[PDB]
Every structure is written in C-alpha cells, then in structure tokens.
Amino acid sequence: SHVKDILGLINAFNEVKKITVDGTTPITVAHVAALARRHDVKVALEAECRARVETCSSWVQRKAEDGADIAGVTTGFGACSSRRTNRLSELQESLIRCLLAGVFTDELPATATRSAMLLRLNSFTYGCSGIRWEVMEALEKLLNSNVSPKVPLRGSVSDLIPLAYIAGLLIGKPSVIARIGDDVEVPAPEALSRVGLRPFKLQAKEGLALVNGTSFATAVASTVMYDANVLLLLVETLCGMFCEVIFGREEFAHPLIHKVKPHPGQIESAELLEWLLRSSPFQELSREYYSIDKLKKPKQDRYALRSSPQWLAPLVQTIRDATTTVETEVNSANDNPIIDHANDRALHGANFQGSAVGFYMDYVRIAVAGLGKLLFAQFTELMIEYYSNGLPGNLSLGPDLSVDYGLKGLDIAMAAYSSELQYLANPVTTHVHSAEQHNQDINSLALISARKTEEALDILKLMIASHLTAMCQAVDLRQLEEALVKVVENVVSTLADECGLPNDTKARLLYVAKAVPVYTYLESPCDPTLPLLLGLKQSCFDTILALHETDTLVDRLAEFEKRLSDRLENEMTAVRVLYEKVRIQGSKFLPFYRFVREELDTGVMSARREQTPQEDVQKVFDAIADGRITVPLLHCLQGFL
Amino acid sequence: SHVKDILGLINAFNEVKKITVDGTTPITVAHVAALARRHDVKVALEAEQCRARVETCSSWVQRKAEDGADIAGVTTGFGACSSRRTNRLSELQESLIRCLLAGVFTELPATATRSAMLLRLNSFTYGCSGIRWEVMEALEKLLNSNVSPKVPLRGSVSDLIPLAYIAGLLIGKPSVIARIGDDVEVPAPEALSRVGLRPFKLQAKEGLALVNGTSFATAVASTVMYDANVLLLLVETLCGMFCEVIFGREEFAHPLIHKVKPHPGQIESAELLEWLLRSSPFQELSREYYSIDKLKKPKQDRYALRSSPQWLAPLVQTIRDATTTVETEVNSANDNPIIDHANDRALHGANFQGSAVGFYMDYVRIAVAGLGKLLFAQFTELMIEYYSNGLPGNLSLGPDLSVDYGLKGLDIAMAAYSSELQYLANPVTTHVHSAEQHNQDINSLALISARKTEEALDILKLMIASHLTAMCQAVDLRQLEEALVKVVENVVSTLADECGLPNDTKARLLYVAKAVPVYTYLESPCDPTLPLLLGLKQSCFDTILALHTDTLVDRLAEFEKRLSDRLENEMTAVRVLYEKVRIQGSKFLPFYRFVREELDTGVMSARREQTPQEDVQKVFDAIADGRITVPLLHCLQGFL
Amino acid sequence: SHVKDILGLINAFNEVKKITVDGTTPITVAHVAALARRHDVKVALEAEQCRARVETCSSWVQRKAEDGADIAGVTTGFGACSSRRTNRLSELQESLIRCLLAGVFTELPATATRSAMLLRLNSFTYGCSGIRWEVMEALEKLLNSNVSPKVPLRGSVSDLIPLAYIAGLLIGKPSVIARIGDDVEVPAPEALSRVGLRPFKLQAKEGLALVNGTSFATAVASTVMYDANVLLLLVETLCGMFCEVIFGREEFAHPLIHKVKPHPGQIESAELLEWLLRSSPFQELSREYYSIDKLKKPKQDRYALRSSPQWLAPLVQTIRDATTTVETEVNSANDNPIIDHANDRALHGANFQGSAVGFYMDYVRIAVAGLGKLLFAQFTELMIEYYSNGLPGNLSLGPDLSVDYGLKGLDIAMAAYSSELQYLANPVTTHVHSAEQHNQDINSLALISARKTEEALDILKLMIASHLTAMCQAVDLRQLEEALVKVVENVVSTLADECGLPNDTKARLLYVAKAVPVYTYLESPCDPTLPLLLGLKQSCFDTILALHTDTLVDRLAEFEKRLSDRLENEMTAVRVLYEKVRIQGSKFLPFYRFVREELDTGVMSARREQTPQEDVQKVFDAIADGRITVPLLHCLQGFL
Ligand SMILES: *N[C@@H](c1ccccc1)C(F)(F)C(=O)O
Ligand SMILES: *N[C@@H](c1ccccc1)C(F)(F)C(=O)O
Ligand SMILES: *N[C@@H](c1ccccc1)C(F)(F)C(=O)O
C-alpha cells in the first residue's frame, strides 16, 4: 500500500543522520527534506567514486587542451556553439559572468539553495561531468557548514542563472553575497575564508558543469513531493475523523465496492478508512442516531464523505507517481555534454532539460487543488446544521448564539483558500516561449511550476490546520451532546415519576427527550417556541386523547411543565460548565484530539474561551509546518497492515 | 517498451471481430475504439459466464424491494432526497428518468453514444446492478443493429442526463429520437419495433442502474486514449524523420545519455530514435555537411530535436498511465448501490464518481499540448533558413521565390493550432461547483474534461498532418539539393578544363561549388550578387595573387562567360527531371511513399496546382481514419 | 442608461431593411447581426458616396506598382519575405492566395462568413486599400445572393487563411466550394456563373487587400457583442423576477445605496430593478410573509439577489465598452499598406492586427462567466427549501414527492453549465507564439478568442432558458401556495366553530394555519408528524392548560379527527383546479404569458407528460431565435 510507503518516508525523514553521496546509493525526497530542514543532518561524500570523478576531469582537461571539439568546452554556449576557442578557462569565467543576471526584488530560500547544492553534488558523483573532486569536497564542506549564496527568485526556464550563484560562491566572486546560518551575510571570498576554503579557478568544462543542471527545480520539487506525501496521508486519515464527527455511515469504505472499481488509490484509501472506523465508538453513536426516526433521515451521506475513496484515487496515484519521477531526476547526471571517458568521447544531448519534473509539477498542483476541494466540501457540511446531523451551525457552542458566531471566520477563510488554490492549479508548462536566440525552442519551466506547487501546498497546510481544528471542536460538541441528552432524559424520567404521570405519558415524553436534537434548544431549553417544549406539548395533547380522570391528569401535566422550567436548565448548565472546566478515548483519532487539546493546550471554542480562532489554528498550522503532526499520525496508524 | 504496447493496441484495433462481454475478460481502449469506428465489429454478450449472477442479482433486488428493505434509490428518493421512502417501486424508477430527460439541443456523436452503451452493458456483467438479463440482451441487440438515441452534448457533472437517453430508448419514450444507422431517425418506440423489441417496464432499481454510471465520460476517454497512444507513437517516430531532413546529429539518442537520466519514457523514446537513425543515408549527408567549413557551423542541434527524448518522457508516461486508469474504469461496476447478494447487502458508496477519469483527462490534455509544442518548435526551425542547414525559407522550391511563398500558410496555421491547444490544456477539475441541493459537493466533471482532451487531439491531428507534409517536402528538397550540387560541381570542373585553368584554380572553384548552399542561389545561379559567383570571384582574386597573368585573367573571364552560358540550363534540366535516392534507404520510406504515391501528391511549387489544403487534407484524413498506421507499422518492422 | 442603449440595439436589429455601406455611415453590431440572421436584409453599396475615392486609390496603386514604386506586398514579398522585390504584379497576388488556401476540414458557419464579407466590403469603402470598385460590387452581389465560400474553422492568428477562401471564390478557384442558400454547394466557378459574375484576375495589391484584414475575428465578435448585450439585459431584468418568486426584499435596489457607491453599471442595474419591483403584487406577498413570525426569519436576503447590482456593475461596463471597441473595428480600414493617394504615399503599418478585438473578447468571456455564476447562485437558492422561503425542494409540486424530483435534472445541468463556462473564460491572448518565421512575434489570436466567447454565450443561453423555466414554475407554486393557505384557514375556521371551540382556541389554530409553510405538509396534510398537525397539537394542549374540561377535550378530539374529513379533499380540489392572480399585476407577466401561453407549457409535475427537455427546449429556441425580445421589450415599456 501507498500508506506503508508514506509511513516509510516519514520514518526515513526523522531517522536519517547522514546523507551518503556516492554515485550508487539513491537519495530520496525524505533525504532532501531532512538535509533542508534538520541542520544536524550531514552530507558524507564517500570516495570509495572519487577515482571515476578524477578519470573524468583528467580526460576533459587533456582532450580540451589537445583541441577536441566539445560543446561549451572548446565551443561557445547555446545558440553560439559555432564559435570555437582554445581559451579554456576564460570561456568558463565568461559563462558565469554572463549568467549572474538575476535581480533582487524576494529570493530562493536557503532551504532550496542548500537542497540544490546537494543535488548538484549528487549529479557529479556519476563521473560524467568533468568537475574536479576538490570542487565536490568544497560543496560537501559548504553544505555541512551552513553556507549558501543568496539567490534571486526568478530567471530560470529550467537552472542556469540560479546555479551561477553557487558557481559564483565557489570562485569567490565579490558581488556574490553568501549566507552562513540565519543572519550572517558576507561577500563570497570571506564566506569561503570563514569555513577554511579558498576560491577556485575554473578549468575546462567546470563553469558549465556547475550551471548545466536541473538542481533548483528538482530541489523544490523534492520538498514539494515529501510534503505532498505527508499531507495526502493526513487528508486520507482525517476523512475517517470526519466520518466520526458528521455521523457518517462507514459502509462507504466496504472493500467490495472498491474491489469492483479497482483503481489502486481507491482500494488503498478505503482499506485505510475501513480499518480506522472498524471499532469506532463514534460509529456506534451514528448507528444509534439513524435508528431514531429512521425514515425521516438520509439513507446515505453526502459526497464529501461517501465519495472520498473515489475522489482520492487519482490524487494518491498522481502524488506517488510524481515522487518516483522526481527521485529519478535527483539520481541523474543532469548535465551536458556527458563524458563517456571509458569510450573516449563526449556525448551531446540535453540532460539539463527539466521536463519530467516540470510536467509532473503541473499534475501534482491539480491533485493538490483536488485535495483542497475535498477539505472545503467537508468543512462546509460541518458548518451547516442542515447537513451536520445535530451539530450547531458554525459549530457554535453558545448557548447564547447571538454573541457566538463560532467558526464562521474560519469558514469564510476556507472559501478564500480553496478559491486561490484552484487558480494556482492552471498549468505552467503550457506557457513555453521560444527562448535564448531561439536555441531553446522547447523549455521545461520546471522551477516556476515547482514554485507554484509549493505555494499550493502552503495553502493546503492552512486548510488542513482549519479542518483539524474544526473536527476537534466537533468531537467536543458530540461528547457534550451525549452528556446533555442523558441529563434531559434523566430530568424528564424523574419528573414524570414525581408528578405521577401514567406510563403512556412517560414513554412519549422520554421519546421526545431522546429524539429532539439538543443543540436546537440549548439556547433556552424551556422556551415554549423551541423544539423540546414543542415536542413535549404535542405528546401531552396526544396522551390526553389516548387516555380520555382528565382534570387530575391535566393537573399533573401542568405541574410537570412547572418543575421542568425550575430544574432542567440548571442541570443542563451544570453538565456543560463541568465539561468546559468518553467516546474519543476509544477512537483511532484519540492521538489527534489529545495532541491538539493537551499538547498544544487548546479547548472547546466559545465566548468564554479568550483565545482567538487565529491563536488556536496557528498552533495546529505550526505543528503541520514543522512536522510535529506526524507523531499523532503515526500513533493513529499503529498496527495498520 | 511502451512502443510494443502501442503496436499491440493498434494490431488489436485492426484485428478484433467480436468484443466479448462476460464480466471477466477485459475490454481495452482498442476494443472500444474498434466498436465505435468499425461497424463490422460485433458485441458478444456471453450468457454462460454471467447470466446466472445477473439473474441472482435482479431477483434479489426485486424480492428485497417488495419486502420493504431500505435501499437508496430503490425504496428511497434520489441524491439529496434519500430520506423519503416509498413502496412505489416502478413509479420511482419512471420518475427518475422523467426528471433526467433534461438536456437541450442547441449533440454527442453516435460513436460516443454506442461506446457508452457498450460500457453500461459491461458494468452490468459484474452482477452488482440488479438490472434484468433481458435488458442486457436488448442493449446487445441495439448495439449490433446500429440503433442509438440522439443525445444532448451537455448537462453531466459525471453521467445521469446523457445515460437517461439510453434508458429513454429502452422504455420507448416518444420524445427520445433514435438513429438507425446513418440515414434513419425515428422516435424510440418505432426504433424498438424495427429491431423486434418492445418497451421495457422498469422494475426496482432498473432506472437508477441504467443512469448511475460513468459510461459517457469513459466512452469519450477511451477513444481519446486510443488516439493519444497512436498519435504519441507517431510524434516520437517523426522526430527521427525530422532529424533526417534538418541535418541533425543522431548522437542525441545515444543510450548512455539516457541511461544516466533513466526516466522510462526518455530511455524508450531514445531507444526508438537510435534504431530509426542507425546507418541512415540522410545522417550520412548530415556528416558531410558538418565536415564542410566545420568550425563555422553549430556543434549541437537546437532543442526541438536534441531535447526530444527528455521532452517526450513525461508525455509517454502520462499517456500510458492514463490508459491503465481509463481501462480500469471501463472494466468496473460503476453503479450505486452495489448489490452483494451473496451476503444479503446493498452497499452504499459512490462508484458513479468519474474522478479517476476526470483528473487523468486533465493531465493527458497537458501532455497533448506538450506534444503540440514539440511539433510547433520543429516545424518553425524547418521554415527558417537560418535554422534549417541549407533548406530554403518556407521550404519554397521556387526557383522564382517572388511567386512562391511555399508553406508559409501552413506555418501561420501551426502557430494558431499550438496557441489554441495551450489554452485548451487548462484544467476542468479545478472548477467543481457544489451541485444538486449541495449533495454533490465534490463532482468529477469527467465528461467535460474528456470532451476538451478530445478537442485537443483534433488539433494535434492537424499539426501532425502539416508536419508530415512539410517533412515530405523537405525530403524532396534534400534529394534535389544533392542532385543540384553534383551538377554545379560537374559544370565547374568541366569548364575549368575547357578554359585551361591551373590545378590550383580548379581546386578552389570546386570547393566553392561544394561549400555554398545551393538554395541561396538557385533563383539566379549566375547573379554576381548571389553566393555562388561571390565565392567564385573571391577564389579568382586569390588565385591571381597566388600565381602572380594577362592570359590567366583572359581565361578566368572566359570561365565566367561560359558559366553563364551553361550552368543555369543544366540546373534547370535536373530540377525539371526531378519534378516529372536517399529516401530509398531510410526507415521513413513507407511514410514518404504513402504520402507521395498512395495519396498521390508531389513536391510543392508554383507549377503544382494543388493547394496546401488539398495536400494536407489527404494526410489529415489518413491520420483520422487510421490508414496512417500502415506506414507506421511498416516503418517499425523489426524494432525490438 | 445602458438599458436604453440596448433597447436601441434590439429595435435596430428588428427594424433595419438595408445596410448602407458608404464609407461614412457607421455599421453597428445590430446591423451585422441583422445581415447574418435576416436574409431579407440587403446590402446597399452607395457609389455616389465613395466610388470616386475607391477608383482614385486603385488607379494610384496600379500606376505606382507598374512604375516600380517600392510597396510591401505589392512590389515586394509578404511578411518575413518583404526584402524580395518583384515586377510580377498579378502573379505575386495569385501566389499569395495559393499559399493561404491552407485550412483543413476536420467549419465557420455561413452567418460568420457572410458577416466577414460585409466587413471586408466596409473596410474597402474608406479608399485606402487599392481594390477595384468592381470587386466591391461583386461582394455586394454575392452577399445579396446568399453565396458564400465554405471556410475551415482554424488557422488564423488574426485573418489571412479564412479570408483567402473569400478571395478564392472571387477568382474562381476550383478547389473552393461555395454555398448558395441552405441547400446547394458547388465549386467556386459555377457559383460565380449562377450569379452572373466572372472570375476576377487579381491586379496589383488586390490579393493582399482581400486577405489582410480582421474581418472574421470582427464578424464573430459583432454577433457575440449583439448577443451579449441582449442576454445581459435579460439577466438583469430576470433578477427582478427572481426577487418576486424568492420573497426578496426590494430595498437592495434602493437608489441611495448605489448613489454612495456610484459604479455606473451598479446605479443603472439598480435603477431598472427598483422600477421593475415598485408596484409588485409579489413584493406585497413578501412583506406579508416576513410580518408572520418576523423574528424567526432572515432580516436580509442572500447575496445572489441582494448583491446583484454590485455584481452586475463590471459586467455591464465590460459588455458596453467592448461593444464600442468592436464597432470601431467594424468601421475601420483594417488593411496594409494604407494608401494615402492624396499625398502620394503607401503607409506601412499594422492595421491587420486584431488586438483590440482579441483583448476585449477575453474580457467579455470573463464577464459572461460572471453572469453565469449569478444565474447558478440564484437557481441553487430556488431549488433548496432551506433557502427558498416556503417553496418546495426542487420546485416539486408533488404532492407525492417520492415520485416527483421536480427540476433536479435541470439543477444538475446548471452546475455542469457553470463549470464549463468558468473553464472557458481563461484568456486566449496570454498564448501568443512567435509566428511566421518570427515576423509575427506579437499576434492577437482574436478569432480564436471570439470563438471561445461565442461558445460561452451558447452556454449562457442554456442557463437563462433553465432559470426562466424555473421561475415560471415558482410563479405557479407561489400562486397555488396563496390559494392553498386560504383553504386551510377556511377549513380550520369553520371546523373550530362547528366543534364549539372557544374564540381564543380558534384564533391560535388560525394563526398556525397562516404561519406554517403549506409545502411542508401538502404531501399528507393530516399526517400527525408533519408541521400542520404538530402546530395544531401544541395549540390544543395550550388551550387545555389555559382553560384548566371533558367536553372541551371531546370537542378538541373531534376537531382533530374531522380534519381528515375535509381538509385533504379541499386541498386536492384547489390544486387540481389550478393544474387545469399575482402575476397579472406583475411587470414580469409578459414573460410568464410567453412561456405558458405562447410556448404552450404548464406547471411541471408527474401528471404533466412533457419532459423538462421539451419545456426548456421551447424557451431556449425563443432565446436563440430572438423571439424572447418581444416579452422583454413589453416588460420594459415605459422605463425612463
Ligand atoms: N544548456 C545550454 C546553454 C545555453 C545558454 C547558455 C549556457 C548554456 C548548453 F548550450 F550549454 C548545452 O549544454 O546545450
Ligand atoms: N448518484 C445519485 C443521484 C443523484 C441525483 C439524481 C439521481 C441519482 C444517487 F443518489 F443515485 C446515488 O447513487 O448516490
Ligand atoms: N500581414 C502580413 C502578411 C504576412 C504573411 C502573409 C501575408 C501577409 C503583411 F506582410 F502582408 C503585412 O501587411 O504586414
């Protein structure tokens, strides 16, 4: 299952200490994200591939000096390949001068730049580039010392310009500013000095080897894919939590439905959902709910739940397939020419072309928009009492609703999030311009597309934060609902006894107490115009007709109504105040609820809780953003398969 | 390789005579396309494999419904109205169809409608729907007799409305119009009567079972995917023909380049291209071209060729992966509720949701726009003399270029095609509205997206037809080029002898004859301002300096004189002969022969009265109708 | 107001008999639409006005060209080939047409082609083109004889290729096919023969003059803009009908709201709605409805109604501004070079560039998607009982809702329509490719854009047809609702008397009869679990408490029981009578009368055999063919 694979990715991300870089061991997107996000993670360039790098650089320098005809080595660049030259080093310097052509408006973050440095280093290990081993050592040292050039955001059609800043750092260009850690910014020569390095003088092919790759597009794509995997699993998992709070019917996940429409992501998402819901105490409450006035309640849930495995299917498949493609790029010799020293030739192709990554970034962004739409639809149902099977509008606890609009602010924001996400999911690859003196008449735009997919995932994180916050609110509301109905049942049962009401009467009144949704009268339980009293009055008329001594019965019914308005509200208030100052304990989602409520220190939202929706959602968003959210996720999924 | 898989689809499409429909044998996109496109193809619904499970299921449903089992859309209302119950089993199903006959004629083609009928029939064979066997037999007979309802284009969010027209035909609704073949349209009851059927009276679940599927989206997606596979292979293949006519360097396809960046589609497209170009006689002309004035010509080709395997990789993978997804949908019980009669349950889910198809239709449309951009970039290079390595601008033969703008009209149209294609490739699935009393708060829009991808492929067909036409033109221009240079060399060599020029002078003049691109002076070979005489004059001045006289000057003046007597006539003669060879040893011979001989065309010029339209129409028609697969399969004979 | 301007356009469309083409009188979008759609409308080319300047100009060009003047595309090659000079004046023009007959049939409708012919003729009247007057006479004759070439859909980046087919017809190219009326297709030479014309022999500049224009993009844009104006006014107007049936509060249109946020389209749409709603019998019912249980009902309407003027503002302004721009293009010399014969120069520019039209087609398509979203929002509200203030879900009459899903099918199609419309409204102009040997490195794509906006308007027409059909259903439901509540009140009143209930009891019971929405219990009025009996039970218990006996209880039990004697029977009788009033005093009467009486429809239900398709088709056809303007103009009589 993809679920196992994604669990493996999260474990790899957490557990890795050293990234082995050797030209044979694959680097995964979890490795890239770990390097970028955990500075205790170190690169270990393992020589055992040094010999082949050396053979390659020796071949290049010798052949170039002998006058071999090799594009971008003894010839001009791009559309200028007709021009030949024996000025081997000057050719390489002229390239970097030409490409230091970005403008600061905004910049690629250090996370992306360090990731790109890793990916360039990795490419060099295959022994096809002709770069000196010493330059590779320097990259390893820069990576492990938290040094990176400041790189302008735009200019790549995929990654000459941004890679030129890494080259600029290595050759000690004074105009190139380098970061060391979070605040220090110094010119390149002093950055090199601070970490015990000296500037390189570029030899044959070395300028081109440094800039002629897909490292920035693929770096961003790697963290994008790591995040898309984690957030996909989170969304699939939270569909079960939605089913719990909305009073869904877990049958939507039945294996036979999916066996007969066997898209792999459809089968796998449902398999997870069936397992999450199998022993659910909330599904027990759901069954009890639909057995009361069965024929007045929907037979099936709305699509945002019942259709979730069908919806998720292409999203799972897209994200998993795109992960394979990005990792193939990470572990490639993206460079040109490709030096085949074993056969004494330089091969002229286009491995710098980032089209595999670019197209898949467009697809993943559409899939991400699909995930956001699922979240938006679920959230919408949860906010509307007509669709939420007993929950109050806006998940407002009240009881005074005139001064408690609940999660209405979050609801409005969810629409804004989904709307921007759908806009972002238009493709970038459809916008190919004929570029660079018409030499680059197809080009991938892969870094641009990866950047837009990253922006989409940022919005998805916000939507997940909100949805999880709303579902924790709904857990509290469902627990309080159960406690409140029992209080109402007990008060009605005991007052029927006290007032000496007949059994026909007692049975009718208890039915009303069980059947009427408590959140419809919580605001003023003894209001004669609200559903509890309306139900009770209807039943009182019916019992009088059924039993038709009349005057003594009426006497006792009037007394019942009097004592109800003296005690009911007080008992309902007490249980609520107690709750503010259980089913979730038996649920697979207990780790999420516990994390949000206890670990992040939050509570049921109301006019009495002084923290803002911002303050609460911020805590959840921060935990999604920094990866702490994977702890409850892995706890929740323990034992699955 | 995907190449063998696609060849397999093509052979299946052409070879199938009967489509077996039995609940276990898979239907591929080739089977769907063959049914749609070849009326000789018949459906064979196999009773022995599946009648028993179908009958068990319908009996179960009718018995449970009559006993008051609570089953959504069977004893309850539809969609947002599932909370209402009823024992009016038939009337409930009638009311559904009445409600859904809601399209407007401002239609879906018969190909798509018959494909959808096939797909609905297939869904029923899994024994989860509750429909009667007799209705399935009626669908088979309608399919085999070329009877299908006229269906409105729009209304589906994925396929209640369009499927209701098939239901409408089955129950003999007078407002539903049915085609019988190409020439007859009659009301539904008359159609049933003409093929010996009577209208069905809907039983429990049967109206819902007929409409609650993904049949139209998946029907369109199936022919879309068949076409996308064929056109993909054609585009990949034609990258090799482009290399041949543009004077490319075949090294771009070297397997080591792709071994070190091993996207499967990159490896596999390069593998095909290496094989197509191996020992090519055109690649031999290319080598010679780059050996002449070597240091003044590009070391590498432009991206439209050199970067082609890298570009193709995601496009190959998208199209092959979408094919798998669409075929899983074709072979699924797309219906709800799903009847597990063996365990006495009606299972409530959403197999009517066409999301797997819809999302993949969005992706394929992006991939098709990628294929179009590749074609546009190659065609652009081919039209511009600065980028075509000796070819004339617009592939104009002339010789009089003032009255021959060649393929400039096709070039303009290629920009228009690519532009519209890029626009079409925006996603449909990003436009989900919360629909049907907010019950359908996610919905796939799969049929809309499939229709847009279908529109995109129509345009790609146009682009391939033009590109292939242009490359046949370029084949003729390269062959004429080789013949012309030999004539110029012969005339120069024999006039050098005749005029008694030194061996030094003879050699210099022959180099110019070899080096100057003939298309730069074909218009007026002896014009002193054009590159032939310009090179000759330069060489004549140098030779006077190297030998320094009065008689040498006399002889060189006699050479120039005699050149203007002889050269143009001999060049005209060889061109005229050509209009009234390397391609014979090229793997692309079957394409050139198909376009020139079988479709009856010729090198384009002011002397050929057929318009670019007339020539491209023939090629486009052969792409549209499948004839193009013959030269394609011939071309690839022996590959792997 | 833009309202008066649109009424002006409609009147012109209907009343024009002859289009005057004279080089000074403007042609509007109503004129283009009328020529395209009304064949009795004839072109009148006026010689006295512009023949002299035409003849002066064609004489200047022929003389200058024959004398060797250097003029692009006249004595030089075309586009990227302008450096090539020639004295082959006629053959240069022939070579252009040959090169541009490059479209493929996979076609533009005759309406668009004939509109394009009108527009090319118009451009020629400015006397800047050099075309012969006789060619202009031939276009007038072809137009008036209903002869037009068959033109391929694609190939223009804006309109050389499609215009080449008009040129092909005029010069009698055999490969060009011509329509004569609805039924006849012949080769171009026979078409000319039948109208007494002979093939033209192109003189200097004339091939270019025929093709170097924006005629097709602008022809499509003209009918698009005419339709956008009519449909805009229809949507605005129908917002008032929506208010009436939804029980809106007309105060949203109050002039002060819009004076303080004075976007011209906001003020003018609100001004119309204020006037439409001012003496409304439905707004009277609305106010009565909100006076009953006032504090339990919304203070404000939802945005689809209350925010309509603010929403409409940019859409009105976009559509009106685009009309101006399109008309400027219709009335322009879109040609190149521009001959200034009076100053003896040929001016080299780019008036063939259709960028003004292209960009505005993108904007209008965005505005059309805005209008579609407004209709979708209103339709959605109307289908959902929680949002419709007493109307039944799906506007189902029932009474048995288990077999009446009302307009659910139409609701689903409205989501499908809006979804596709939002997708279409992505821009085309963002997809400029560098075209035609990189000569056309900016190009407008105006025809492609115009075509997409036309497709969006087709969808908007379907949405308006559905929305108007739904609102007529709602009118019937509101009128029936008022009649039904009166029946319930009378039954309750008389039974309360007959059972000898106290006056206080009678008054409480009557309040329930008035306050409970009748559509919540119409299905089974005496059902003890539905809201009528629930309210009566509560009231009966409260009476017992208030007066706290055995005779009171006996009489209350009799009241309840006798309710099932008469109530359902009288409610059935009044409904059945209705099936076989407020709208008579409403400004929307003409629409209701048009849909019900003129189109022959009725309140939708399980008893009415017509399908939703059959009903919506009639409304759609009337929108499409312009009949809908009759009730629109009647509705608006007396406005300002
Ligand atoms: N990627 C190409 C390039 C183009 C412009 C400037 C620098 C480099 C390349 F020419 F170097 C190549 O390897 O194809
Ligand atoms: N697909 C659903 C439907 C909705 C509206 C009209 C007809 C059918 C369904 F309700 F039938 C379902 O199976 O969920
Ligand atoms: N619009 C130009 C053109 C380009 C290619 C073929 C025909 C015409 C033009 F060159 F004619 C011009 O007027 O700029």
Swiss-Prot record, chain A:
Binding sites annotated in the UniProt record for (E)-cinnamate: 212, 300, 306, 336, 408, 436, 439
Subunit structure: Homodimer. Homotetramer, dimer of dimers.
Biological role stated in the UniProt entry: Phenylalanine aminomutase that catalyzes the rearrangement of L-phenylalanine to R-beta-phenylalanine. Catalyzes the first committed step in the biosynthesis of the side chain of the alkaloid taxol (paclitaxel), a widely-used compound with antitumor activity. Also has low phenylalanine ammonia-lyase activity and can catalyze the amination of trans-cinnamate.
pH dependence: Optimum pH is 7.5-8.0.
Gene Ontology CC: cytoplasm
Pathway of action: Alkaloid biosynthesis; taxol biosynthesis; Phenylpropanoid metabolism; trans-cinnamate biosynthesis; trans-cinnamate from L-phenylalanine: step 1/1
Main location: cytoplasm
Catalysed transformations (reactions): L-phenylalanine = L-beta-phenylalanine; L-phenylalanine = (E)-cinnamate + NH4(+)
Use case: Could be used for the stereoselective biosynthesis of beta-amino acids via amination of cinnamic acid derivatives.
Subcellular location: Cytoplasm
One GO BP: alkaloid biosynthetic process
This protein's name: Phenylalanine aminomutase (L-beta-phenylalanine forming)
UniProt EC number: 5.4.3.10, 4.3.1.24
Outcome reported for the amino acid change (mutating residue 300 to M): Increases deamination activity with beta-Phe. Increases beta-regioselectivity in the amination of cinnamate. Abolishes enzyme activity
Species, as recorded: Taxus chinensis
Result, substituting residue 303 to X: Abolishes enzyme activity
PANTHER family linked to this entry: HISTIDINE AMMONIA-LYASE
Pfam families per record: Lyase_aromatic
Keyword Cytoplasm: yes
